[PDB]
Write a protein that binds this DNA or RNA. Structure first.
Lengths: 91, 103, 533, 99, 105, 94, 104, 83, 98
DNA sequence: ATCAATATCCACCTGCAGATTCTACCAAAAGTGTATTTGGAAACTGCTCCATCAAAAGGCATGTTCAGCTGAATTCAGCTGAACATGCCTTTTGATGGAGCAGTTTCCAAATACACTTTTGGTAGAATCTGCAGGTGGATATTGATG
DNA sequence: CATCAATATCCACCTGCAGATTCTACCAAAAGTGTATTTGGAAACTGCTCCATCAAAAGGCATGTTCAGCTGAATTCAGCTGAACATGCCTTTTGATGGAGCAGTTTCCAAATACACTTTTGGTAGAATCTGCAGGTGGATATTGAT
């Protein structure tokens, strides 16, 4: 099979840091934030992390309820609307 | 012989798109909508339908009423939509029902 | 030996200068270094480009076909050991394209026809126990003695193989040419094969081919069709237009028998004849391209004359028609096809035939009517496009006042005040007898037959075309139909099965211009040999 | 010789306007998809994901972040400041009631 | 002869709304004018929202409505913003808004 | 007068099971009745939405169980699921 | 002559829950075990909050549960507080909570 | 019936101070009270109308506790103890 | 004359009103205000006493939560005294205003 | 460091509205047993679409410098907290005309439940059309910096 | 504070393409009409519960005033931490491609209504006894501020 070039990309464990510094900077700029402290980013990361089990778990609870193995956009739509954060365009 | 059966698996789904586009022609004949735009419009109309139907069903349940009529729907329009939007929606519904009755 | 070295240095140097694609082949494949200990298990001939250079330098190669075989063996090894998703496979594909571009002028400079590695399509085998089924391709099959084959439902292997092309050695210079590339046949030239270079060196010319389409026996229908096509081409005056020869090469009298269902329902009651006699004719269209005859169109027809009992009387039916898209010019090609069909529609109405029937059924994918192995780039027409093509041909025929009118079979049945299934024509191999048998069976499980016939008639009205050639009182006082063309006994075209079987067995493909020319030449030789008994 | 250098804030305000006038996604697809996959496998292993589901989750998370960042900027400004600190986001989540 | 929407002068299908109300388990009985009234309300909402979206598009020198135009239409209308205060728009973005203190000088 | 049903004796029996020597006041009793009614309504509505989303016209133990998992947080959900599973097991075992 | 509530060994009325589910128009059909499961969940929750309210009352030297005891129980449990984060308890007041900065 | 007016002043300054004390607020500025009053008015304008919209729907002329509690529930402010 | 330092009586009230649960808004003025609001909304209305109590406790609880949020914002601004901008910030973050 | 002036905690006891304990009804539930209907368990399967890999490329991760943001220290005008005098208006108990909330009968216009004919919306495939995403050329404030 | 000059970008214009728009034909799923059956709540009347209104007394905070403690607000200035920017590379995205599962088809059996009896019993009017804590009394005990 050969290959010639292959990178391990050991990022799976620390994928919360996968959210790049410029990504959070851009998100804050969209939020109208002019100056950002150094302690915001990782903190927001945790906030991001929290939101995941706020939504996707419910979607997972949806996926198990439908006897499916694939998470669908409709599961995500009900997961978000059940949190009071209804999303349009993915119906 | 047999042809164009498509393996009898023609997936179909209902949508308000073609109706909403018609409404577009009533308000902006020379303006179009993207696929994302029509998807968001369908999601919005479905969300409004669900909210208003839930409010009307709850209001019918409150008064021990087993039939849904336009009265509790217009009451729910007053409850959920803001002032001018609710008033205009109520007027449109009243005119539509009056014309339908006389039709 | 330095001559072939001087010839072949540019070809391999162009291969080397492709970076970074050609890097993995610079050195012998090292399994332990590359972490692939299974390389020897699958690949039986490990060697690389450096070995190729050493063999090209140390007096190992006697003639360039060995070098061509070595580089193509490298290509096959890289393709077989690596998945096409892998980097090495796509690098090998790019280098193969480069070599295919480079080698041809160099190989031709050495007096050879070409330097391509050419293999035929996989040869689908046939069953022997059932005598009716065949061996599926890319599927589990059983074989014995390399002569007997069996299917999975009738040595266990899967049929995925490629048959290479044969080679012919020149009698004078000893060089080896492709049989298809030079179009050499032993029967035509028993004296032996001589390459073009040797012939031009001594100012000689190849002996005239006596096994040609033009030298085939002449017939009135074929002569008329070829005259019409030639007149049309002369009127058009196309620079790429050539000479088209049309020969009626098979004509035999057969009979179609009523199937058991209709035999019980109507024949046993004395309302139908037990069988209908007809004359089946097979003809092919040939054109001279580059001084070589090439077959580009053929069709099979069934003709029921005035002696045939009704409702089949004086009716012609097109059972099968096929064509190969190698006619020059391309733009007139389709028109030329029309210039054939209309001419046939004329000839029959000169004999006395009044009705023509066409079944617009496009071939299924992987299926061929007459010409085996259609070119991959030749698109199969869709049913709607085929129907529009037939409508255009019929309109062109009408514009010449040869055809009065044409209709769908449903409208024709409505106009013909049809009240029973007995009034439809009965053709051999036609869809309608089979669907009528199926309707009879369905009635067996359950004017009902007429109702089912009408339902099927309306369902498939756009597929069947009924053409009126002679209409009105002129169709009621015609003389008996006499065919001036004598019978042509040829079992090789008794149906479309024999020609397809012969092409599959002898690898007579029509997938390329040279291959189609070789197949046409072989067909002509076979016909000329079968004529003499 | 004195290379051109914008003062702190000019580029900040420029990118403020640029990212408030645009709607393109700001989180890269692959890392967020990996994070969602591992969070899902924390609850149920061997799960599969639709592309539309991932896009919807990304849009929802970015919308929640932009709203929360607006709240944090407002809270920081309330303290006579222009730079947000974790206390601002903690206050924003407390007022929203998430914590 | 005439569809219920045509009789009531409506674009959305009254029959489909009636069927969804029946299947939505909202009540054991469903009135005749209820789908008509609901369809009229929905038509008014879509008419106003697409009118605002077209206004935003023509202000943005655009002739095709995109999610950005829908977001501008809903957010610049405080009534629509109150209606969709708990709704986020796919690919809609946010309104251009810079704080006073963040502004220079 | 029209009967106004409530969970009176059931909540009182639960109190006696968990606290034999502790009583409840009238206002607290009304709060508990409102709580149980609200939880019933929430779970039933969530189950109805679950059935609607999966094109199911029947509410079984699985739908309401999934609704409880969605609404009840963590240990509360786990204990409720276990107790309800035991209850339905005994119900179907007779 | 065995009641469906006692058949599962529950105190809450299974029949009443089933009847309310039917009257609630949540679905055209309701399963047999759904009222049993719902009654079990409701009775478990009732036991949990009642036990916590009794503990709070005992902490206040009270043997009668008052709305203040219910508020103390509901707000002192993290999961229960999350359950009723948008619910106001009648006559319950608020938890005694003073932050250090206001303190001397 | 008498048309009551200027009843927002009935929420006395000590009452707002007590509400702040229950809310854990230690110090009150002078402009707080009136501001809170306005917010309170808005809150009432948020609920009573809905209850009235309920009361009008039931063909009743008195506001009941069920209307109030259900309007609070539909406003995301569910209240217990009143049915 | 004995006098307490500022904040001592305020904190004593903090415990006093965080320990007890009786209503702190006078019944009659709030009922009159509710009547005024109803009259402004619809003429000739009547009110049940339980509805009045439910409205009163709902407004009291909402104001208690708002005061807690306002105080948290006040210390967030390094202050001990709450000001109307704190209430505005709390309402804006809650989403009730914008 | 001690001490006086207050608020806090708390044990105790008395009167009582609210919590708890029997008696009898009973109709609305609640339960059991057939006839009936049906959402769904279960197996085989076509077909999506989801996991996986290599190249092109579009940014992302680091080091420097400092203008400017944040934060610490100082002072004070005054405002709100603490205390107190005066009294008012809300709170509590009592009674009452009556507008109005609610129980019971009747029964019709409105609703439901199929049967059936009408049309209408959802999807496939071809082929023409088009709004707009960038790419190239000025070139327009503008802001940092020079003066 | 007026203006050489690098830079991001709105606009004037363009031009190619993925996506939106137009049209033809097919076809199952709605949809409207008709006929029969069923019933939800309107009106009609009336029993009755509590909603609104008036009256009287009183004291608990409501309102106003006064004194000043300390707190937000203003000011100043210093440690320093992020913003802007140049530099290096590397992680991402997209296209292509095996097969894990999402749905479509078919059977049929355990399971959920319809409904007519038959039995349990949760509200609940009524009267009597029990009982936890509201409220006032009195004195022991932190708490606070400044003597």
């Amino acid at each position: 099979g050969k290959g010639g070039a292959k990178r391990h990309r050991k990022v799976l464990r620390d994928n919360i840091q996968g959210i790049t510094k410029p990504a959070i900077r851009r998100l804050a700029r969209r939020g109208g934030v002019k100056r950002i402290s150094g302690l915001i980013y990782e903190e927001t990361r945790g906030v991001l992390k929290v939101f995941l089990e706020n939504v996707i778990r419910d979607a997972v609870t949806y996926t198990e309820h439908a006897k499916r193995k694939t998470v669908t956009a409709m599961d995500v739509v009900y997961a978000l609307k059940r949190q009071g954060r209804t999303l349009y365009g993915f119906g | 012989q047999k042809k164009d059966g498509k393996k009898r698996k023609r997936s179909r789904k209902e949508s308000y798109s073609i109706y909403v586009y018609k409404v577009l022609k009533q308000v902006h004949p020379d303006t179009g909508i993207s696929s994302k735009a029509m998807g968001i419009m369908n999601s919005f109309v479905n969300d409004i339908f669900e909210r208003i139907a839930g409010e009307a069903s709850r209001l019918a349940h409150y008064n021990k009423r087993s039939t849904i009529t336009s009265r509790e729907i217009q009451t729910a329009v007053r409850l959920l939509l803001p002032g001018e939007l609710a008033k205009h929606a109520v007027s449109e519904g009243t005119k539509a029902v009056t014309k339908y009755t006389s039709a | 030996p330095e001559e072939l070295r001087q010839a072949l240095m540019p070809t391999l140097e162009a291969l080397y200068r492709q970076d970074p694609e050609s890097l993995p082949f610079r050195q012998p494949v090292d399994p332990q270094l590359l972490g692939i200990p299974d390389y020897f298990d699958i690949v039986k001939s490990p060697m690389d480009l450096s070995t190729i250079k050493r063999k090209l330098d140390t007096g190992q190669y006697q003639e360039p076909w060995q070098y061509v075989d070595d580089i193509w063996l490298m290509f096959n090894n890289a393709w077989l050991y690596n998945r096409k998703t892998s980097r090495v496979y796509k690098y090998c594909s790019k280098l193969s394209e480069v070599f295919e571009q480079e080698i041809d002028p160099v190989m031709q400079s050495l007096g050879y026809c070409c330097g391509r590695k050419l293999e035929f399509s996989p040869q689908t085998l046939c069953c022997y126990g059932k005598q009716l089924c065949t061996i599926p391709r890319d599927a589990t099959y059983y074989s014995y003695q390399n002569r007997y084959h069996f299917c999975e439902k009738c040595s266990k292997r899967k049929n995925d193989t490629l048959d290479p092309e044969l080679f012919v050695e020149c009698t004078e210079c000893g060089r080896k040419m492709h049989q298809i590339c030079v179009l050499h046949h032993e029967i035509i030239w028993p004296a032996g094969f001589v390459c073009d270079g040797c012939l031009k060196k001594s100012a000689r010319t190849r002996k005239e081919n006596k096994f040609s389409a033009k030298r085939l026996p002449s017939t009135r229908l074929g002569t008329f069709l070829e005259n019409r096509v030639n007149d049309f081409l002369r009127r058009q005056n196309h620079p790429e237009s050539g000479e088209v020869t049309v020969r009626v090469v098979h004509a035999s009298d057969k009979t179609v028998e009523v199937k058991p269902g209709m035999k019980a329902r109507f024949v046993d009651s004395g309302e139908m004849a037990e069988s209908f006699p007809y004359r089946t004719k097979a003809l092919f269209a040939f054109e001279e391209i580059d001084g070589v005859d090439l077959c580009f169109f053929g069709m099979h027809v069934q003709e029921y004359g005035s002696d045939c009992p009704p409702p089949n009387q004086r009716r012609v039916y097109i059972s099968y028609l096929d064509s190969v898209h190698f006619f020059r010019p391309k733009c007139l090609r389709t028109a030329v096809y029309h210039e054939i069909l209309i001419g046939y529609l004329e000839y029959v109405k000169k004999l006395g035939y009044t009705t023509g029937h066409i079944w617009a059924c496009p071939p299924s994918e992987g299926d061929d009517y007459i010409f085996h192995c259609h070119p991959p780039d030749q698109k199969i027409p869709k049913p709607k496009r085929l129907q529009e093509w037939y409508k255009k041909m019929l309109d062109k025929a009408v514009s010449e006042r040869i055809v009065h009118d044409y209709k769908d079979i449903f409208k024709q049945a409505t106009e013909d005040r049809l009240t029973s299934a007995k009034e439809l024509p009965y053709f051999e191999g036609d869809f309608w007898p089979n669907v009528l048998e199926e309707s009879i069976k369905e009635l067996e499980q359950e004017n009902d037959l007429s109702q089912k016939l009408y339902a099927t008639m309306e369902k498939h009205k756009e597929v069947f075309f009924v053409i009126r050639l002679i209409a009105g009182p002129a169709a009621n006082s015609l003389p008996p139909i006499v065919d001036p063309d004598p019978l042509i006994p040829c079992d090789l075209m008794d149906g479309r099965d024999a020609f397809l079987t012969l092409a599959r067995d002898k690898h007579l493909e029509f997938s390329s211009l040279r291959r189609a020319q070789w197949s046409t030449m072989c067909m002509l030789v076979e016909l000329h040999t079968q004529s003499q008994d | 010789k004195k290379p051109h250098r914008y003062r702190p804030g000019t580029v900040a305000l420029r990118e403020i306007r640029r990212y408030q006038k645009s709607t393109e996604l700001l989180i890269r697809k692959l890392p967020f998809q990996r994070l969602v996959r591992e969070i899902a496998q924390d609850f149920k292993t061997d799960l599969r994901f639709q592309s539309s589901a991932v896009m919807a989750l990304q849009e929802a998370c970015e919308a929640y972040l932009v709203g929360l960042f607006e709240d944090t900027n407002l809270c920081a400004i309330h303290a006579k400041r222009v730079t947000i600190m974790p206390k601002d986001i903690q206050l924003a989540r407390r007022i929203r009631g998430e914590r | 002869a005439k569809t219920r929407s045509s009789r009531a002068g409506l674009q959305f299908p009254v029959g489909r709304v009636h069927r969804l109300l029946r299947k939505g388990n909202y009540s054991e009985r469903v009135g005749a004018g209820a789908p008509v009234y609901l369809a009229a309300v929905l038509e008014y909402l879509t008419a106003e929202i697409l009118e605002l979206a077209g206004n935003a598009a023509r202000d943005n020198k655009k002739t095709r409505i995109i999610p950005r135009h829908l977001q501008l239409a809903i957010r610049n209308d405080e009534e629509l913003n109150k209606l969709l205060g708990r709704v986020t728009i796919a690919q809609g973005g946010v309104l251009p808004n810079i704080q006073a203190v963040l502004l220079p000088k």
